[PDB]
Enzyme design. Sequence first.
Site: not given
Ligand SMILES: Cc1cc2nc3c(=O)[nH]c(=O)nc-3n(C[C@H](O)[C@H](O)[C@H](O)COP(=O)(O)OP(=O)(O)OC[C@H]3O[C@@H](n4cnc5c(N)ncnc54)[C@H](O)[C@@H]3O)c2cc1C
Ligand SMILES: Cc1cc2nc3c(=O)[nH]c(=O)nc-3n(C[C@H](O)[C@H](O)[C@H](O)COP(=O)(O)OP(=O)(O)OC[C@H]3O[C@@H](n4cnc5c(N)ncnc54)[C@H](O)[C@@H]3O)c2cc1C
Lengths: 589, 590
Positions: A149, A154, A157, A291, A295, A566, A571
């Site tokens: 790894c 891991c 890569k 994989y 990858e 959001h 989500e």
């Molecule tokens: C290209 C690739 C990508 C991977 N990507 C991921 C990933 O993204 N996420 C993930 O969860 N897993 C991933 N894996 C799997 C992960 O690497 C293995 O599951 C994990 O490393 C194995 O753990 P281990 O301790 O069993 O063996 P290893 O990590 O292989 O350790 C064994 C060690 O013992 C040594 N050894 C062997 N025989 C002897 C001996 N007689 N005496 C002493 N030392 C010895 C070996 O050379 C090695 O150093 C990937 C594997 C590969 C090949």
């Molecule tokens: C800058 C900013 C960033 C935000 N970022 C996030 C975020 O990342 N994630 C998140 O979950 N929330 C976020 N929020 C909060 C989110 O926008 C509000 O919670 C959401 O808009 C509420 O929806 P609502 O239906 O209650 O009101 P609104 O979505 O405001 O709708 C009310 C609407 O009714 C209209 N209206 C009012 N009175 C009348 C009327 N008498 N007749 C007709 N139309 C009318 C208004 O003009 C408006 O269009 C953010 C808010 C702001 C201000």
Amino acid sequence: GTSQWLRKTVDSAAVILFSKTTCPYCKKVKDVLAEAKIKHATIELDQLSNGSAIQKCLASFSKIETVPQMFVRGKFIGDSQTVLKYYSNDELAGIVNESKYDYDLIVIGGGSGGLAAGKEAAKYGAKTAVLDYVEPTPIGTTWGLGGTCVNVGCIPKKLMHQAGLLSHALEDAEHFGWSLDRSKISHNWSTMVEGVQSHIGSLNWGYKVALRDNQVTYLNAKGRLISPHEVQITDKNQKVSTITGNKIILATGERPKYPEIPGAVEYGITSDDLFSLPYFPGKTLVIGASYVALECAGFLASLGGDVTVMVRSILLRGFDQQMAEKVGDYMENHGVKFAKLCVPDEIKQLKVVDTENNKPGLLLVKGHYTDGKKFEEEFETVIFAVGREPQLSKVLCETVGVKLDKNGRVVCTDDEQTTVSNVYAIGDINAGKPQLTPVAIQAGRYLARRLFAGATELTDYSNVATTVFTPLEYGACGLSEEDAIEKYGDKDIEVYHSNFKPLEWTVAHREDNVCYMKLVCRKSDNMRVLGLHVLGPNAGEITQGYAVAIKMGATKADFDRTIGIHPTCSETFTTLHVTKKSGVSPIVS
Amino acid sequence: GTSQWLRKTVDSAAVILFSKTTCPYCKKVKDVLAEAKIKHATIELDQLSNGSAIQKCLASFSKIETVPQMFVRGKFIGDSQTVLKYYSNDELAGIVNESKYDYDLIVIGGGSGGLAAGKEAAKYGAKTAVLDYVEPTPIGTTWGLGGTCVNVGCIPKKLMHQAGLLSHALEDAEHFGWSLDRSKISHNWSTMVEGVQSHIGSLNWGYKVALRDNQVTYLNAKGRLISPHEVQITDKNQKVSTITGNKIILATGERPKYPEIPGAVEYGITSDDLFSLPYFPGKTLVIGASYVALECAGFLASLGGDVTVMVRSILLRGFDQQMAEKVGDYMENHGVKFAKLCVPDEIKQLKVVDTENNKPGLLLVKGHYTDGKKFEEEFETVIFAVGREPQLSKVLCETVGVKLDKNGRVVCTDDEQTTVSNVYAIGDINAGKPQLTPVAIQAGRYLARRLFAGATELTDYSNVATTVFTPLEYGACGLSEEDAIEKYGDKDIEVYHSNFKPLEWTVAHREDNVCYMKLVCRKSDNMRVLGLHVLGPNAGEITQGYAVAIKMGATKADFDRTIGIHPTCSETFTTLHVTKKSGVSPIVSG
Ligand SMILES: Cc1cc2nc3c(=O)[nH]c(=O)nc-3n(C[C@H](O)[C@H](O)[C@H](O)COP(=O)(O)OP(=O)(O)OC[C@H]3O[C@@H](n4cnc5c(N)ncnc54)[C@H](O)[C@@H]3O)c2cc1C
Ligand SMILES: Cc1cc2nc3c(=O)[nH]c(=O)nc-3n(C[C@H](O)[C@H](O)[C@H](O)COP(=O)(O)OP(=O)(O)OC[C@H]3O[C@@H](n4cnc5c(N)ncnc54)[C@H](O)[C@@H]3O)c2cc1C
Ligand SMILES: COc1nc2ccccc2nc1CCC(=O)O
Ligand SMILES: COc1nc2ccccc2nc1CCC(=O)O
Ligand SMILES: [Cl-]
Ligand SMILES: [Cl-]
Ligand SMILES: [Cl-]
Ligand SMILES: [Cl-]
Ligand SMILES: [K+]
Ligand SMILES: [K+]
Ligand SMILES: [K+]
Ligand SMILES: [K+]
């Protein structure tokens, strides 16, 4: 049913204190041990259902029922009065080191599981050794402490994957108003590999020190189990000595397979060689469809490579095939070519690798499609990703009596135990278990606790989430749709699905309706989620959290009653309504 | 208990079918309705605990206990023989339109809650109207259908946040081996705003069509409740007419507050104006410290702005303050300056906005610190983010007898019901609810089902996760550490924490030990997770999944027994071991 455990715990624990949280004398013993830098297991009888029972049962071993009671390697050394004595006399320090064996634990293999299980054993006073040896690849490639790894898996890569995605970030930047000319920006493979190797080199040393810090004896040596407590070690000088251990953890992992065809070993490479490759692979063929293959193909193509994947049957065998096909279609519409239903027959050499000028060579691949038509094209580099295998023929003499399955893997019980009572197996070599780093880590720690701290908790290998770091990432947790349908039947499977578009892709003019998620649920069990699947950016980040809900038995009602964050990709899992039964389109608008 | 429901359902349902899954004639009636394009509620008696009881109780309304049984606005239409008769005669499209009211549902406000609740009502045969009118800001800014989030909130602000993050992507690329010099690359505000507005325009149109497609009557009109079923509309021509509705949903949301100081309304702007602003703000002051203020300050700074935040008291009031302080420290080491313990007294104008050259004007901000010291600096642009308020009619809702609280917000029961039996309130105007888009959507849909499809499911407003899209994002779900300690006592609160470094930051030479997560758990309840908190990249994506485990009552043991995905930021939540009690450091290394 307590005494079975107490025998097992006392006898295998290196240093253990039968204690209470509310024992003033238990506090004095603890305080002193920490000052003498004497590490130990602590089992608090006042925080166990069976506390009373264990106190009365210790009488067998200690002749007394009081707390505290300190044990070393199966032997009662005393109460608080006896331990303090040995301390003021300085005979305590040498008493806690008295062992039949050189080591309480020898760990063969310093990879993901080995290092984890060694560090944990040492926390609870275990005289520990980690053996690691990296046998070189056919072209000579080798590397430091850490396992597959850290050095060739891991870590490198994903860093190269990141190199890949930054390409699209350069594209996306122009649209989001940034004044860079993506057309006049190229990638330097050597700069990238320098940075990746730099980080691995620091993980190598990091692991060396983690071992030193926790008083674990690291030997850079090939280990070989010649009997249940004897390990034969062979250092870089071929100097062959023996060291004895109480508990043996096999943690040797796997290495890449090569197809048995002429030129494979001589002229082509694997993942082992790729992640330190000193030149750009250039025009590349990846043989294999796991994989690893996709990858590697994905990141090479994103770094301006000319990449072809040769697929024997299907993509990501073992994964949900709808999602596998969507992963492949993405790569195909984004610069990766596929040779479908094709196998290699022969690797022939046209040019040798030019180490002088850091160019690759040139190879001719002869193969054939399932209908019998020929395959013949030039490639600078040929990567085999056709599977990984253990080789315990190297590591365990077949005469020790550790049963291996038909595929060379160790047959273990639910507590990682082999067919030899004192010998255990973890990580990729443990037959049947998912071959993942976090799984080798949790298995190794949970085992070390069970051996040296009287823990009973086993590892849970079920519903282990994954992420395939293809150009478009595929996260999953639990059953493929096809597996759920085979196990429960089609009439009992409801599938909720939806496309989505990351908000980040809107200004960036990327695809509507290519990102995709579904929940495979079971009608007769409150629409229990059996399977979560998602194709989009940061799939790993998205998927992870849900693994906890699924472990806890999340239903579809549980996803519905949760409110989304959001704006996110994640989500869309909180508002799925479209079923596969309904035939309604999952495209969104 | 169950006849009380049946009365409520049959009376308020527009079109509803009492069915069974294995009723051949129930299938025939359904099939026909779908061919006639007649939308309806379906309750399947054979999929309910109470099925037998409901069959016998229908006899009150229909005089029979057979299935199927079709109803329209509380009137029994017939069994399968009568419904197939009305279909082949073409009297059927006629019969499902007959209504006392012009509309089964009028929704006042076409934003996040309103649009969601209207689209859902129409799915179950409700004759629906959505009213939306955007009153312009002081400088005249206006926008299309969609609400605050679509045009002035979550959508534009995250797109600008993305513009911000790509700055770091340009830096990270050089280190990952790409051949660009970040130093020779600048940002064009107009290009960015063009693309963001293009996307909003496509959502404006998208929503207008979604309504038309589902037979919802969109009116671009200021709506006013003059009595319980009467809504007074006023169109762009000042043509003032009345429309009647059976159920009324108020979904009017909020608009930015301005401080009562000279020059605020005249010379400065809000979030409403920023997201279509035709010129880069340049040297900018943000007044306020809410998620809007620091979100906006963060992206402006990342796009080469000279940015200062004036903070009356603390950052992100209502959020965990350890996390708020860490968000602020990130922004401070990444180009945002803060004026702490400071309020504005006066906005004075030195130059007028240059509409000729699309550059901003120049303002003098006079203020003062809590110790009494003066504040005086020039800013090209001044953005107020000091709160939002319901602009709800303040005396009209009284005439109608819809109780508003002291802050202008509608006092509703747990079923979104106002103090008038047929009138409901959702989204930001609903007193006490989290002011979030997905909360407005869930509220709106779940209400429409309860009115028109005999649903009983309420909305759960508890442990609604959030994410502050500050340059380094802060996701959270449930209690702040300080809130948990106040409620349960410190002895009963165990806090697991750890720093982390994204692998993506390693080759990129970004910070060790600035990313941070913790779990606030309750000792006496199996270490129940009361709060999850995380500062790092993709915090929203990280946080979301855990919202479902926490809803289900996840313990620490539940996080431990789950295996991580490697390599991710998220996985560090599956191996937390360091407690705050222990005093051991959160810092890490491979
Ligand atoms: C290209 C690739 C990508 C991977 N990507 C991921 C990933 O993204 N996420 C993930 O969860 N897993 C991933 N894996 C799997 C992960 O690497 C293995 O599951 C994990 O490393 C194995 O753990 P281990 O301790 O069993 O063996 P290893 O990590 O292989 O350790 C064994 C060690 O013992 C040594 N050894 C062997 N025989 C002897 C001996 N007689 N005496 C002493 N030392 C010895 C070996 O050379 C090695 O150093 C990937 C594997 C590969 C090949
Ligand atoms: C800058 C900013 C960033 C935000 N970022 C996030 C975020 O990342 N994630 C998140 O979950 N929330 C976020 N929020 C909060 C989110 O926008 C509000 O919670 C959401 O808009 C509420 O929806 P609502 O239906 O209650 O009101 P609104 O979505 O405001 O709708 C009310 C609407 O009714 C209209 N209206 C009012 N009175 C009348 C009327 N008498 N007749 C007709 N139309 C009318 C208004 O003009 C408006 O269009 C953010 C808010 C702001 C201000
Ligand atoms: C996991 O290795 C395989 N298992 C198989 C099981 C049944 C059928 C074919 C199989 N093929 C492979 C590896 C070759 C391939 O993936 O095409
Ligand atoms: C809601 O706004 C505030 N609430 C408070 C609650 C209790 C004590 C003080 C408070 N000050 C504000 C005003 C904004 C700010 O926090 O600076
Ligand atoms: Cl090393
Ligand atoms: Cl599909
Ligand atoms: Cl910066
Ligand atoms: Cl990142
Ligand atoms: K080999
Ligand atoms: K979407
Ligand atoms: K939901
Ligand atoms: K880390």
